[PDB]
Scaffold this active site. Structure first.
Site, PDB file in Angstrom:
ATOM      1  N   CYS A 157       0.675  -1.168   0.020  1.00  0.00           N
ATOM      2  CA  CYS A 157       0.023   0.007  -0.036  1.00  0.00           C
ATOM      3  C   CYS A 157       0.668   1.214  -0.153  1.00  0.00           C
ATOM      4  O   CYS A 157       0.217   2.430  -0.171  1.00  0.00           O
ATOM      5  CB  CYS A 157      -0.944   0.006   1.462  1.00  0.00           C
ATOM      6  SG  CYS A 157      -2.529  -0.829   0.954  1.00  0.00           S
ATOM      7  N   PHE A 208     -10.525  -2.403  -0.815  1.00  0.00           N
ATOM      8  CA  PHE A 208      -9.910  -2.249  -1.958  1.00  0.00           C
ATOM      9  C   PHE A 208     -10.483  -1.955  -3.238  1.00  0.00           C
ATOM     10  O   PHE A 208     -11.757  -2.354  -3.311  1.00  0.00           O
ATOM     11  CB  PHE A 208      -9.096  -3.477  -2.343  1.00  0.00           C
ATOM     12  CG  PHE A 208      -7.982  -3.951  -1.333  1.00  0.00           C
ATOM     13  CD1 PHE A 208      -7.201  -2.883  -0.986  1.00  0.00           C
ATOM     14  CD2 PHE A 208      -7.501  -5.087  -1.023  1.00  0.00           C
ATOM     15  CE1 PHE A 208      -5.980  -2.909  -0.016  1.00  0.00           C
ATOM     16  CE2 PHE A 208      -6.364  -5.336  -0.183  1.00  0.00           C
ATOM     17  CZ  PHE A 208      -5.624  -4.315   0.282  1.00  0.00           C
ATOM     18  N   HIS A 296      -2.225   7.786   3.075  1.00  0.00           N
ATOM     19  CA  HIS A 296      -3.014   6.527   2.396  1.00  0.00           C
ATOM     20  C   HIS A 296      -4.284   5.968   3.318  1.00  0.00           C
ATOM     21  O   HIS A 296      -4.121   5.712   4.277  1.00  0.00           O
ATOM     22  CB  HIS A 296      -1.981   5.437   2.298  1.00  0.00           C
ATOM     23  CG  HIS A 296      -2.656   4.011   1.933  1.00  0.00           C
ATOM     24  ND1 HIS A 296      -2.832   3.169   2.781  1.00  0.00           N
ATOM     25  CD2 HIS A 296      -3.157   3.634   0.958  1.00  0.00           C
ATOM     26  CE1 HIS A 296      -3.391   2.200   2.154  1.00  0.00           C
ATOM     27  NE2 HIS A 296      -3.926   2.220   1.054  1.00  0.00           N
ATOM     28  N   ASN A 329      -9.835   2.056  -0.878  1.00  0.00           N
ATOM     29  CA  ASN A 329      -8.222   2.107  -0.664  1.00  0.00           C
ATOM     30  C   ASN A 329      -7.992   1.269  -2.026  1.00  0.00           C
ATOM     31  O   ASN A 329      -8.119   0.212  -2.211  1.00  0.00           O
ATOM     32  CB  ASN A 329      -7.907   1.136   0.544  1.00  0.00           C
ATOM     33  CG  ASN A 329      -6.630   1.056   0.822  1.00  0.00           C
ATOM     34  OD1 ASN A 329      -5.525   1.709   0.082  1.00  0.00           O
ATOM     35  ND2 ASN A 329      -6.182   0.190   1.758  1.00  0.00           N
TER      36      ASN A 329
END
Lengths: 382, 382
Positions: A157, A208, A296, A329
């Protein structure tokens, strides 16, 4: 010095964010995800996914999996079944294409000719190919035969941060180099059916999403032709203490699996402050509430505990939450989208800078081994 | 410039070449390899592999896939069987450990303290892992927490050249950075049983060997403490005009496969000169026959046609043939071993430079898509 180098910091001369046309709502995402993989009868695990999803500050998700793609490639819909071949074909055709659409957007925003591209830094957590997604992107745009390609496969990530750092070093070491910093992510090899044995997989599935972030990275932009949006100033990593198998990503025959050996949200959240408290020193150490947060969006636990442990204003970390809600994400591309959304919020609200008024910001990426990929950026004036 | 900036070309301050203790003579390799994979019963395919082996200019090869390893770990002995998981379990420990012994040798030759390591550039076309072989190497040597790791997975046979270029940019951009340029290559995911359909598999099996090459790459070596062996001067890459699926590496569930569509030896050999002609200019063309040849030994066809076309003396390209005979084709590590053997030959016969008297040399790497990774090196005296 046979190959001349640059004389300025790496700058983002154009941001291209491309997402697949299909979109999904996190309000209806759990039902669709538990229906499409034929795993909707697990009522208790379904409710756990509900709790994670509504806990997740996520509203919308963009994926190439759609429905036609998912039924056309049924191997992804299963759990622990060898399917890297079909996922690999999917990423081979699409990750370069999503990267190419994002790169066309970033070039139009950049304005420079495609023949001026010389470098391609490409991080993908989804798929692998020796002919190269970097080479595929080079051919698709038709840049040039002399194109140096750095392909950072299987970055976690923090892949967007790693691309930013590596493209910074590439652009700052080659004169006139126009690095296409690509972090295209198509969650086809990480996509999996929900399993109670793998709760980190549940967190990922609730988080995700697909997304292609392309930055035209280079030093010394041409005035009145190329404009800089963000100036990379720092880059570093640190294996924070007690980081032993917290996040474990194995690209097995079934794809990429973030095996649950530890409480990832809590561990990352409690370990974020460590490297942050020292990574801001070269800037001049302004106030922690005078810096925007291109963090993030690894899940609301991370944002909540970072806010609590640094006592930040609610609006300081709002761009990461906005990207989390709109896209989720997106692994490497997630932080690039966060930076793009910060710029969009700055221009929408009439902020002084492209960082919502903050002159400096954290390009935070975290992954397996708790490596804290941190870049400090300077936002261009708005 | 928050992060300080280096000055001077990237230099190889220490070469560490580690191979597993096991040895396999190419005179006896075909029988052993057709016996271990239960494929020795054939006649025509076996004879073809014999011809390729005795035309391959190879004498012995080092592989961690010994008798004990290969029997204790089946699946690698099969063809078209999903085995990436246990090959991965092999290479998440052995690739880092081979890299670690090679790095210990490179450090002892380098002399500097391990805690001075700040970067790890790692090419591995053999295996993939998100926790990181770079991170595993960083832990194994016990380096600092602030170790920036660039991990290039599935680079290909030009992976050593790509590591050299990327580590050159990393060391030339960060002051005092001590990049561990690693190209550890354990042929576990690419090891394959013979098959008539995959005729490129015969070439790979007859050529692919296991080895780890580690370079301590950095700028501004410490006088009387750090000595430079080779200084990188150039790096480039072109996709030669007739490059369409010649080499295709798909890391499927069965591992890494070099599927063939065209004559790889013939095409690479016919296409090398196209970029070799132009990559010389930066240097200034000392002389086509006044340059040592750190060419990746991709098979004696490549050496034969390059020699014939560019009119090279027999002793000019002897180091690549020596590495081919003693270790085979070790993908990314092969070119690093070729450079080390060139240095050893120079010091054995008392050559004026570390390149058999030639001031400049070609660090040639080629892979899928006919990318010609070319680096021009400068050999140190004596």
């Amino acid at each position: 010095r046979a190959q001349p180098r640059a004389e300025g910091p790496a700058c983002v001369l154009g941001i291209g964010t491309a997402v697949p046309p299909a979109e999904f709502l996190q309000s209806e995402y759990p039902d669709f995800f538990f229906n499409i993989t034929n795993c909707g009868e697990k009522e208790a695990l379904k409710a756990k996914f509900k709790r994670i999803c509504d806990k997740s500050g996520i509203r919308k998700r963009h994926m190439f999996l759609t429905e036609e793609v998912l039924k056309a490639n049924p191997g992804i819909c299963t759990y622990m079944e060898p399917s890297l071949n079909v996922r690999h074909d999917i990423v081979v055709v699409q990750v370069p294409k999503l990267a190419a659409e994002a790169a066309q957007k970033a070039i139009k925003e950049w304005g420079g000719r495609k023949s001026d591209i010389t470098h391609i830094v490409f991080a993908t957590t989804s798929g692998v190919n020796m002919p190269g997604a970097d080479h595929a992107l080079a051919k698709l745009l038709g840049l040039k035969p002399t194109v140096k390609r750095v392909m950072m496969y299987q970055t976690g990530c923090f892949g967007g941060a790693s691309v930013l750092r590596v493209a910074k070093d590439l652009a700052e070491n080659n004169k006139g180099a126009r690095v296409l910093a690509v972090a295209s992510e198509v969650t086809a090899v990480t996509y999996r059916a929900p399993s109670e044995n793998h709760l980190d997989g549940l967190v990922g599935s609730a988080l995700f999403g697909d997304g292609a972030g392309v930055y035209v990275v280079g030093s010394d932009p041409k005035p009145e032709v190329e404009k800089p949006l963000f100036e990379v100033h720092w880059a570093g990593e640190t294996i924070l203490p007690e980081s032993d198998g917290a996040i474990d990503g194995h690209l097995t025959e079934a794809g990429l699996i973030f095996h649950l050996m530890k409480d990832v949200p809590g561990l990352i959240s409690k370990n974020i402050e460590k490297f942050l408290n020292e990574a801001r020193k070269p800037v001049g150490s302004p106030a922690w509430n005078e810096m925007f947060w291109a963090v993030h969006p690894g899940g609301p636990a991370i944002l909540d505990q970072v806010e609590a442990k640094l006592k930040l204003t609610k609006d300081k970390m709002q761009g990461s939450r906005d990207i989390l809600s709109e896209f989720g994400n997106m692994s490497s591309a997630s932080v690039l989208f966060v930076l793009d959304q910060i710029r969009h919020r700055s221009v929408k609200m009439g902020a002084s800078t492209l960082g919502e008024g903050s002159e400096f910001g954290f390009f935070i990426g975290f992954g397996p081994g708790l490596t804290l990929e941190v870049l400090v950026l300077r936002a261009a004036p708005n």
